[PDB]
Structure formats: C-alpha cells, structure tokens
Swiss-Prot record:
The keyword Lipid biosynthesis does not apply. The modification Phosphoserine is found at residues 163, 170. Keywords: Acetylation, Cell membrane, Cytoplasm, Disease variant, Lyase, Membrane, Metal-binding, Osteopetrosis, Phosphoprotein, Zinc. This is Carbonic anhydrase 2. Activated by X-ray, histamine, L-adrenaline, L- and D-phenylalanine, L- and D-histidine, L-His-OMe and beta-Ala-His (carnosine). Its EC number is 4.2.1.1, 4.2.1.69. Changing residue 60 to H: Reduced proton transfer.
Length: 258
C-alpha cells in the first residue's frame, strides 16, 4: 500500500514504486567532515524571516508540517550556494524512538536525536509544483537537534501537538516565528540532493548547519506521542520517520567554514 517507515513499506521498499530511490543524487547522506571541501567562494547565508506568516500545522502521516504563506517574498532564503530567492513554504522534523537516532543526515556517522527541515522553493519557477521539476527548484535548510537544554522557541510547537495527534488533523498556527529555531552560527555544509521522502525528486540544494540546536528530553518525548495512523485506526506511534543515509556517488560536500 502507501509508503511509510515500517518493516513492510519502509525506505528499503520505496524503490519499487519510486525508481529514483536508487538515483545519483539521493539524500540524506553522511557528512564526512574530513573530506568535505572548504569553499572560499561560498557566500554567507541570508535568512530573512522577519515577515514570516505561519498559517497551519498538520499531521500528514509520516510527520507534522507547519505551513507558511508563500504568496509573496515574506520569509526567504538567499545567499550561500543559492542563486535567486527561495520562499519558505513549510518546516517539519524527523525523529527517532531513542535519543541516539532520528536525524537523516549524519556527521562522521553520528546520528542526532532529530532533524529540522525548513523547505523553500525557487521563486523563478512561479509555484512549488514547477519548482520540484527542476534541479535547483528547492533549498532545504537542515538543522540537527540534540537532547540537552530546552529550546524556548520550540515550545509553542510542542504544546499544539495534542490537537493534531492523528493523520489528517490540522490546527491553526498563526504568528509563529521560525527565527526561534535557528542556532547562533550559520556555518554550513552544502551538496545537491533530493527529497528524503517519496517522490524522492532530485531537486534539492541541501544546506545543513554545523551547529545543532538543543531541545529538552520532555520536548522530544512529545514528538514521539504523535500517531502515523488516522483516528479510529490501530495506534502506531510516529517515531523513526527517517531515511537512512544514501551513497554519495559522484558528489562533493562543500563547507562554508574551515
Ligand atoms: N502556501 S501554504 O501554507 O498554504 C502551503 C503549505 C504547505 C504546502 C505543502 O507542504 N505541499 C507540498 C508539495 C505539494 C505539491 C508538490 F508538487 C510538491 C510539494 F512539496 C503547500 C502549501
Ligand atoms: N525530509 S525532507 O526535507 O527531504 C522533505 C521536504 C519536503 C517534502 C514535501 O514537500 N513532500 C510533498 C511532496 C508531494 C508531491 C511531490 F511531487 C513532491 C513532494 F515533495 C518531503 C520531504
Ligand atoms: Hg527536479
């Protein structure tokens, strides 16, 4: 049936319905800090989220997305390895059943507790639908989460999870400021890749931040209480919604710092 993260429909099965799963620029990948190339020509990232308008939060099976109004250049990402303006359309997380796993990308084989993905699309393409059909259509800002101190800016998200426990549920989520989820430093690694969930389109420029943000054990626990299933169906906890690292193949990971 539909794809998932279970034994019978997990990542190892996606290739049957989405041949691109065994493509040349699939994500996530393991970032080997010792072979990543420091690139002096990489420009600093420009994150302008001051005018961000969040609208809704929803459980879509797989994960929970916080959507933003992308009708105008309100929250945009520019700079770095990007050409043009990219609008923030939504952000979501991937997490594990235990603190030692959850992130999609790994650094020197180290998995973090979770990973935040802030998804943006290239404005030159007019709409996200056209953007996903281009090699530079999307830019996803990836941030690692490690268990430690609580992240104040994340609490508003944690408190609302109860109202969207099952698949298909959504709740109004206005006035959320995504700037509250950023680490202090904007140093990053970048490589061309793909969406990490079906349809696995190879249209993403990945920008993974070096500095993880810290979240408390209690905050991460609440992600784990969400459900993959819809209301009235057998309860399957939403945990381990991450795809294992894919072969790097003929790609080079560039670093904005030495
Ligand atoms: N402007 S808004 O807040 O209402 C909005 C928010 C989220 C999404 C979404 O997650 N769709 C994903 C999505 C839909 C179609 C497609 F081809 C690729 C793709 F990533 C769409 C619109
Ligand atoms: N974990 S991750 O950052 O890589 C990621 C980011 C966005 C999406 C998404 O928008 N899915 C909907 C969607 C629906 C239809 C389509 F054609 C493409 C598409 F991405 C999926 C995975
Ligand atoms: Hg593409």
């Amino acid at each position: 049936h539909h794809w998932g993260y279970g034994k019978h429909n997990g990542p190892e099965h996606w290739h049957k319905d989405f041949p691109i799963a065994k493509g040349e620029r699939q994500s996530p990948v393991d970032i080997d800090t010792h072979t990543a190339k420091y690139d002096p020509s990489l420009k600093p990232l420009s994150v302008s989220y001051d005018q961000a308008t969040s609208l809704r939060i929803l459980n879509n099976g797989h994960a929970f997305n916080v959507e933003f109004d992308d009708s105008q250049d309100k929250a945009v990402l520019k700079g770095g390895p990007l050409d043009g303006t990219y609008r923030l359309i939504q952000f979501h997380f991937h997490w594990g059943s235990l603190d030692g796993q959850g992130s999609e990308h790994t650094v020197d084989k180290k998995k973090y507790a979770a990973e935040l993905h802030l998804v943006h699309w290239n404005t030159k393409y007019g709409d996200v639908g056209k953007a996903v059909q281009q090699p530079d259509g999307l830019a996803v800002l990836g941030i690692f989460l490690k268990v430690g101190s609580a992240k104040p800016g994340l609490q508003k998200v944690v408190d609302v999870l109860d109202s969207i426990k099952t698949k298909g549920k959504s709740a109004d989520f206005t006035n959320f400021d995504p700037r509250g989820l950023l680490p202090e430093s904007l140093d990053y690694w970048t490589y061309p890749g793909s969406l990490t969930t079906p349809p696995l389109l190879e249209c993403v420029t990945w920008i993974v931040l070096k500095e993880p943000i810290s979240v408390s054990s209690e905050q991460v626990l609440k992600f784990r209480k969400l459900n993959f299933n819809g209301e009235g169906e057998p309860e399957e906890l939403m945990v381990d919604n991450w795809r294992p690292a894919q072969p790097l193949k003929n790609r080079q990971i560039k670093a904005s710092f030495k």
